Structure formats: C-alpha cells, structure tokens
Amino acid sequence: SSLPVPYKLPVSLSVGSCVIIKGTPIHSFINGPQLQVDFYTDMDEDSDIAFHFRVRFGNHVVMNRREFGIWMLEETTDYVPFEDGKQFELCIYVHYNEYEIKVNGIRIYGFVHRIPPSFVKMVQVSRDISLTSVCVCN
Amino acid sequence: SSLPVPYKLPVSLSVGSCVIIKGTPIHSFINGPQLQVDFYTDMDEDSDIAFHFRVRFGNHVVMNRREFGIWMLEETTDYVPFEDGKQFELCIYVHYNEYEIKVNGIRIYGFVHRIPPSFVKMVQVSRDISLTSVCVCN
Ligand SMILES: OC[C@H]1O[C@@H](O[C@H]2[C@H](O)[C@@H](O)[C@H](O)O[C@@H]2CO)[C@H](O)[C@@H](O)[C@H]1O
Ligand SMILES: OC[C@H]1O[C@@H](O[C@H]2[C@H](O)[C@@H](O)[C@H](O)O[C@@H]2CO)[C@H](O)[C@@H](O)[C@H]1O
C-alpha cells in the first residue's frame, strides 16, 4: 500500500468537491473483505460522522450518519459493482443536496446531507484494503 | 472559469502531497498576464507564506516566502515553459526537503522548505488566469 490504513486525511469540503479513492481489497470476496469511508466532523474518531459508507464486498453496502454520538437510520443498497481481486475507483461527489457515490464510474447511491458537507473536517478510509491514492478535487 | 479567482482552498499538506492546478491565462503573453500560487499558513492573507510562486508568463518566475510578515530572499528562474493561449498544468509536489514544481510535466524548480509543509493551511491561486480544476492528492 502507498498509504497507511486507516488513512485519516484532514479536508475541507464544499459543494463541487470530489473525493477519489483508489485501492485494492486485501482478501478475495469469499473471504469477506470490507472497505469503510467515514466523513468525520473532527479528527477525533468519536466525533460525529456526516456520512458513513461501509462496503461488504460482493454482498451489500451500509450507509449511515452519527449525530450527537448516536447512529441514525441505516441506509443500504445491494448494488456493489466491485470486482474480485481488482483495483477499484470510488468517487464521492459533494452535490448541494447529496453525496453522489460512484464505484468504478458507476453511480450506486446518493446520500442526502443531514448536516452541511462543510462540517466535514476529516475523511477516514479503513479496513481490508490496500490504498493506492486518495485525491480531493475541486 | 469553473472556480472563482482568487481561489482560497483550505488544505492539510504532508510529505507526499501533490497540488495540481489546471487553468488558462486570460490574456495573451504580449499583454503580460501573471499567475500566483501562495502556500499560506492560515486563511488570513496577511499570515506567513511558506512558499510564494509568481509567474510572469513568457518572462520569468519569482519565488519567495514571508516569515514574521517580512519577505525573505527572492529566488527566480527564467524557465517558464507555458504556452501562449493554452491550458496549463502546474503540479507542486511536497517532498521531504523541497517543493518540486512541474509546469506541463516539466520540472522547473525545487523550493526548499524553510518551515515544514505541514504548517500550510491554505493554498491561494490568484491573478490573470481562468481556473479549470484544483486537486490535492496523496
Ligand atoms: O449503521 C452503521 C453502523 O452500524 C453498526 O452496526 C449496527 C448494525 O449494522 C446493525 O445491523 C445492528 O443492529 O446495530 C449495529 C450497531 O448499531 C456498526 O457498529 C458501525 O460501525 C456502523 O457500521
Ligand atoms: O518576493 C516576492 C514578493 O515580491 C514583492 O515585490 C518585490 C519585488 O519583486 C522586488 O523586486 C522589489 O525590490 O521589492 C518588492 C517588495 O518587496 C511583491 O510585492 C510580492 O507580492 C511578492 O511577489
């Protein structure tokens, strides 16, 4: 891996920002690897989370937020077009209303803001992946 | 322009970071356009500047830093391989010792750190350019 995992990147996001994460799962899908991305409101890992994204590869994706320390209503989707053993490209685009989530160019979900994305001060990429690059674009 | 100019982007830089700026001069070279990039230590434009980069297109590049509010010893180079009227790509790579500056893939200079690059909290892109994209990569 080019970057350490868990990878905690201080960020400032606004509408129009784009988070691009490139990496590879470190296990085959029959071994149940996961990939987690958290849009944290501070560097402390107990802080509130504006957007939590957790892929169980070849299985499903769980999404949520954490407000006042409490997990809210979980959202999910079965569309997880990652490929076993291959590098992936995960793009999270900050729209005025939602985060649009693309997996290898394929839009899979829009997670609607319950707090403004400018509250996000850190992005953490974690679990069973090797990280090639993380880029924040405007 | 896709982004407003002057463009002030809050950032957190470390060794291995890469700032990629894509844009076009808004005047032809006989009209003396300039492009300025400042690696500021805070959002206030009077704060200290770890790295100041000022291109007079078709002419020369001035580089400096500002410490305790005082401009230090100016550095310069005559190599400015920008093309009249064309989009450029300016990459600033944060090495452990220096910022390596590439213009359209061409390394033109290495500005050595006099304060650690982790002191940089804002990048400002300014003057006579239209801005297509700014990306911070790791
Ligand atoms: O919602 C994301 C959040 O879920 C936690 O696990 C949940 C679990 O998904 C749910 O099925 C069960 O009923 O409650 C658990 C805890 O509230 C994870 O612990 C957490 O890391 C997030 O992934
Ligand atoms: O050094 C960068 C800094 O220069 C200022 O202008 C200088 C000028 O380049 C120099 O030739 C003259 O002798 O002193 C000036 C001020 O110290 C710019 O004003 C400033 O914006 C930076 O570009």
Author numbering:
A (entry chain A), B (entry chain A): 2 to 139
What wording appears in the published article?
Galectin (Gal) is a lectin that binds to β-galactosides. Because the primary and tertiary structures of Gal-13 are highly conserved among all galectins, it had been named galectin-13. However, our crystallographic and biochemical experiments (solid phase experiment, hemagglutination assay, and biolayer interferometry) proved that wild-type Gal-13 could not bind lactose or a rhamnogalacturonan Ι domain (RG-I-4) from Ginseng Pectin. Primary structure alignment showed that a highly conserved histidine residue was modified to arginine (Arg53) in the ligand binding site of wild-type Gal-13, which may be why Gal-13 could not bind lactose.
Moreover, in the crystal, Asp33 from one monomer occupies part of the ligand binding site of another Gal-13 monomer. In order to eliminate steric hindrance, this aspartate was mutated to glycine in several variants. All three other variants (R53HH57R, R53HR55NH57R, and R53HR55NR57RD33G) co-crystallized with lactose, but not Tris, even when the crystallization conditions contained 100 mM Tris. This indicates that these three variants prefer to binding lactose. The present results showed that double mutation of R53 to H and H57 to R was sufficient to recover the ability of Gal-13 to bind lactose. However, the pyran surface of the galactose residue in different structures could not be totally merged with each other, and glucose residues showed variable conformations. The conserved tryptophan and histidine residues in the three variants showed the same conformation and position as in Gal-3 and Gal-8N. Arg57 in R53HH57R and R53HH57RD33G showed two different conformations. Arg57 in one conformation could indirectly stabilize the pyran ring of galactose through a water molecule (W).
